[PDB]
Amino acid sequence: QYAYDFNPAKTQSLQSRPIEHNKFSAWTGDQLYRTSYGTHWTSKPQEPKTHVPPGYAGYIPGLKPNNHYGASYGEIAKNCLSNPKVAQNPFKLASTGFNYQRHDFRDPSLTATTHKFGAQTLLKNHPSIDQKSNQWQSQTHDSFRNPLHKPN
Amino acid sequence: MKRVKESYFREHSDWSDINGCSGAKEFEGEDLAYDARIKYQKETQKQWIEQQIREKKMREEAERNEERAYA
Amino acid sequence: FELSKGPHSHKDFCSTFGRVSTSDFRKKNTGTMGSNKLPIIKPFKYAD
Amino acid sequence: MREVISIHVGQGGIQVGNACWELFCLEHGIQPDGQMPSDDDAFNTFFSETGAGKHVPRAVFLDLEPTVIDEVRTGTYRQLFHPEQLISGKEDAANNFARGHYTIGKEIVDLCLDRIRKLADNCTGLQGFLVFNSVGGGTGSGLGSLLLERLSVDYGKKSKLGFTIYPSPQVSTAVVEPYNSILSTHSLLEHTDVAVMLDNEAIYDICRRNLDIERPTYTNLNRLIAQVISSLTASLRFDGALNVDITEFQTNLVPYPRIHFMLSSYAPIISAEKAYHEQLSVAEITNSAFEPANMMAKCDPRHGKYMACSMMYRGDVVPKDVNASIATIKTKRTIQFVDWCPTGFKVGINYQPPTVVPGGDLAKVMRAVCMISNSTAIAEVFSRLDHKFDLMYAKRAFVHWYVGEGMEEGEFSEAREDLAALEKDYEEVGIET
Amino acid sequence: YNLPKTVPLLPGHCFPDHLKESHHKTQQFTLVNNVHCEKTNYIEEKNDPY
Amino acid sequence: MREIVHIQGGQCGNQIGAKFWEVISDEHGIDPTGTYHGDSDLQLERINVYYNEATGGRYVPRAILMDLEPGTMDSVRAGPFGQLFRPDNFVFGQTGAGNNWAKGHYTEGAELIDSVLDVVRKEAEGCDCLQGFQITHSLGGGTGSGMGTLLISKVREEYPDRIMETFSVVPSPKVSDTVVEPYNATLSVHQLVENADECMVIDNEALYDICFRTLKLTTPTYGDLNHLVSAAMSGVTCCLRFPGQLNSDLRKLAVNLIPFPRLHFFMIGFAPLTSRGSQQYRALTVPELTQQMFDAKNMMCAADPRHGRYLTASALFRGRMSTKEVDEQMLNVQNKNSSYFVEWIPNNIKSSICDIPPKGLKMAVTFVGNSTAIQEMFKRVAEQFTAMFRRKAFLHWYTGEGMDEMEFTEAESNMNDLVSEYQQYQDATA
Amino acid sequence: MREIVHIQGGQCGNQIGAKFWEVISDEHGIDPTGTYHGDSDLQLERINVYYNEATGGRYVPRAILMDLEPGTMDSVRAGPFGQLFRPDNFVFGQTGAGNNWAKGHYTEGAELIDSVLDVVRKEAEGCDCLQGFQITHSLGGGTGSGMGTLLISKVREEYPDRIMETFSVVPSPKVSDTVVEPYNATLSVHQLVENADECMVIDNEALYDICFRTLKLTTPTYGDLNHLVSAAMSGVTCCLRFPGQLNSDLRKLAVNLIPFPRLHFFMIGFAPLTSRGSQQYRALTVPELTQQMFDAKNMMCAADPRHGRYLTASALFRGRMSTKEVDEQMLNVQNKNSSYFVEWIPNNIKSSICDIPPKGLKMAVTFVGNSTAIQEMFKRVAEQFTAMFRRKAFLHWYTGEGMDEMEFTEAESNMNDLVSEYQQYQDATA
């Protein structure tokens, strides 16, 4: 009838089977998942924190750079956590470093020492229009969030 | 602490239930419910194993999923 | 207290990563598989 | 009216108190946020009403390494505990008992005692303190010693219990832990009312043999110790036909003031794959409790005499079956009691069935037994730790790490002597008249 | 019935033949500087825009 | 459980292992890419005996290949089923052997064997509960008969409790394959006799005779010879891997087979074997199998067993048969030929049964025998050695790297003595 | 809390840091522009340990680059991740040391070191709670091996309670890159033994051997070598930055690894490392991790470990695993090799677990082993130093900046005494 064949079930080579593609993170659905808690109630990575109790210690981002004025520690933490930024890429650089030459490092005046000046103004990380009085900012009447609302 | 239950399974009796019992004729310690009681409880007890078996089996399958992904 | 062990045991000096002449060889029957000779007789107790 | 205060120090103490407090909340029906869902004063032993809704535990957490405490306050139980009773330092003692007893613990002991005062003044019928500590760790041992010595004079006759976790005979984590273990033992000998042995190897063997889990983790152990504590303490917050308290331990299990180290056992511990495929009768569970391989401490009771046994049954057990089992235990020859103890059994019975935690391993059974034995076989672990300590102390290894932190060089000598005196007392008591 | 679709190997069924067009032996195993090393055949892919 | 690791050396060992491994892979239903594709559940219960585990659920053999020249392993890697073995399991030199026992045992093997020792010892500590080692080599070559024997000795001083088996291809002079074969043969046997727990001898002349007369096929090849000996290899250990009425592992075989420690040489055979033109006339039954096993020509050794008396023998059956037929046929053959069995032991035959037959067959059987007739090979090789050593021919090659004639004298004396006590038991009476 | 600052000097140290900061930025999800891009909350919780925060939401490493010549700094600035470092942190001379220990430790380094000491003092005072300092440098070069060590001494005798860790690239003699290596290596070790809390020795030859034998990649380079060193560097402090079953910081490792004050020279190792031809075949389990960790060829030093007895060992695991397997495997490897573990300190291995593995893997192992086998490197260095110093070769060059040979004699006597007393404990018995 016929001779002897080697491969059963006609398994095609992983060599020529399709092409590689972007599921590098196939296993890292839970790679940044603690187990001190975790695996006690949940099995999926914890959502980012929004509130912290007093004396939380490690590095709430907002506080140190721009000195936050007189307000409760938890209040400041909640504000500077719920604020935007602290994430998302406008430049779209990767954390690995393979994408370093996608974006050229530019700092958006013409310095000229021929006759006068040449000091150049400061960088665009300082306030405008927001100049407003402290008694004004601190002293408003009721048009705030309700301190004790929490709908049930 | 307190002694609320005379025995684990049954509470105290209502005053109407204890009508005589001045003479040692009714003790209530004779059950008349023991065999049916154990027969009933064993069934719910097998049920606890039954549910626990699916819980453990699902946990094991979830564990195996991770190795499948990492491969 | 003793825990006498027979065939395999678990203690070794040179198990995993130990290892760092033409004149010398095995003479006649030093090998374990040779030496067709038996030990000496003991009356023995049994009954205990 | 009756309360007990929990003290947790060290990474082991924190990671076991976590499982203990999860189990307590689940048993009393308290949601993780601290309030009864959205749809009885027995909780009062462990918790206290704030008046408006939620309940705050009567416990304190201590550490010098902020990672664990930060992890707690980031977890889901963040709203449960009071924000300022989870005391965390800045620098870890780094397995050094001298650092935790003379250098850095003294700046945190004052805050801890202040919190203990602010917590104890609230209670009115204070039963006692429980303490959890890893004995083989620097900060754990040092801070445990400091708190026990401070409390012994601050409160006096109040009962204190210690659930110490001694190093295993052959497998362990650190290499310097015998020094800390011996020093802490010297400290606790004259300062704790009750000590319970909880070495890891015995629990490892129990889990491997019975749970049929080939790759267990610290969480399973913590769940087992939590279950043991709950079984011990259920007699103050549940009704029972025959009740026992904390004060009903030093009155039944302590033949002499120096002898207060006991070792525990639990039954039944069966995986749900074969859990109820046997009848789980009171006789067989109480026999498995006394079986030597079941003991929660890596010791063989067959090598010594029995001093006293306290057994707590919970569930659907009945006193007549308890006595019937006791008769068989006394009849059995493999186990023998000391000469001067005609009867050595104290029995407590409770009606609350054990509760099961989701994601757990054990099966929720109608009947369970937890056994605490004081026996003369305990000397073996002390003997082997003694050998391990003297082996290194012969050549003065690692001695500089303790001399340079303010500890006098001869402090080792009297700890060694006190261990020797402990074997003195134990082997002297163990002989017949 | 279910007859075997192919030959099952037995002491008298393999029937090897050595009549090929050309017999050449490929040098796969390489020892350099007292270190064993191999050619990476059966592992090469071709190209992609990644 | 009670798994065995495989190690092979030389061209002979490499080819034999290459054939044996594809035989085992076919038996266990493993594809050339290492992924199981079998149908029955029993094929996966005891798979850890010969195969390890990898990520992705694939299997790799626990085999080690050693050589002084990478030519043989280079040829075998490109063959079918060549992707199962691992590159770290290959160890190779760069100088060759030159068919010199001293070269392969004192100067290059001595400095090369460290790596292969590391590999095999790593595998041994990796496996859960080791059962023993099996070797495949030929004594007529340099690298094999030197380095394999040295490795045997070394692993013996390290694992004295484990079992050791060798498949030894002794040279018969009619197939004169190497002029300097007597030196290598006598030294190799001398070294082997005090270390190897079991040895089974294979003769190329016997294989040639089997292929010519039994299979009756025109053009046999070394592939066919290797496949025969590989079937013989798998037959002895089938019982350890598959269930049966009576379990029997190599330790039990040794215990029931060798009476005295200095007699651990066996001669083997396999059944059934039929030609294409004689499979339609032969019936397949236990009497046929038991008739074919004891046939003198069917034996896989040049020795003629009817010239001597069987000391002990053993049979390993495969398939579903009846202990009725097994035992009654064995008693029948032991009773009708009483002259060919030594008198001071009755029931000198061990029998074992495994219920899984080889693929494509109903019943099979493997015969292994310790009989006093193998002394013919030893006597003949001894007379060859002494005749060609009387004139000190070829001796300078061995002497040039430190060896001395006193070791030659001791080895030949040991072999002669072994012949003496091995023969004196033939005439022993009760 | 308990954060550390980075100081690096010489071209070797600069190249090490160039990849160390790269891998740390990858681990914490920081772009080349310094903006946070982390994917979970973990990459941001403890980021203050290595990174300072700046207005505008950007991050700056707390690193100090310190050197006598600007070529390597100006080259490393232009590479990827080269914009992170603050321009003020660069301190550089204009001449260089010319591989003179004298030039790099007395005449120009001491003059330049005022500014770098000022900036290090500023950085240390700015951060709230110090943990210690870590340095990377090579001992075969003048400017590094002198001026880095002078800074080591100055920093130590200001902050004796803070821990000091050093990664020293000691020069193997088989592949020598500078002919005056023994002189400045001896002069550097003499100063290092008196002030460094932990010294971790790294051998270029050992890295070369690892790159050939394990990865089996054809053309490795200094980039891959630096990346290996950086991975080993991060494996030590990973558990300081991530939560785990058992936290273990630098002070804990120091307490648990050095029995005596002068024995603080460590050999490290990283696992798993496998060739891409074998990445699909090895199965990641704790037994494989520990087997590769304790392998002799996997050590980052030319000192062969099995020439002596391990004084102490430490293992740091990264990933989520059962403490069962870690502890039982460690006990097994300790029991199976009782010959190579000193017996008067039982249970001489410490272990730690961290929950966050390196990106792209589930399990990783970092090993630090204090063993007596490292005395070979000191013996060889001393032999070369005394052979070269007996004829006063190259000696006028060091004596031409005020140095005298009595310092050479003092340093060589110090190393000789260290070797003698370090071997003293090898043969000690109970």
Ligand SMILES: Nc1nc2c(ncn2[C@@H]2O[C@H](COP(=O)(O)OP(=O)(O)OP(=O)(O)O)[C@@H](O)[C@H]2O)c(=O)[nH]1
């Ligand atoms: N059963 C159990 N044992 C633990 C646990 N945590 C720590 N241990 C034991 O504690 C010993 C080390 O001490 P740790 O508790 O980890 O640390 P510490 O007590 O806080 O002391 P430091 O390390 O100096 O901070 C280990 O050998 C463990 O056996 C735990 O959660 N469960």
Ligand SMILES: Nc1nc2c(ncn2[C@@H]2O[C@H](COP(=O)(O)OP(=O)(O)O)[C@@H](O)[C@H]2O)c(=O)[nH]1
């Ligand atoms: N049965 C069998 N015998 C072989 C094979 N290859 C070689 N031989 C025999 O081995 C002898 C030569 O052995 P040799 O190659 O020198 O062994 P080596 O030195 O270890 O490589 C010859 O007599 C051959 O008959 C084989 O594949 N099968």
Ligand SMILES: Nc1nc2c(ncn2[C@@H]2O[C@H](COP(=O)(O)OP(=O)(O)O)[C@@H](O)[C@H]2O)c(=O)[nH]1
């Ligand atoms: N690992 C590693 N070693 C290096 C590198 N560059 C140089 N080396 C080693 O450093 C030694 C020479 O050091 P040298 O340049 O004199 O150091 P310097 O005096 O501080 O500039 C050589 O032996 C090299 O092996 C590198 O990029 N990586």
Ligand SMILES: [Mg+2]
């Ligand atoms: Mg700790």
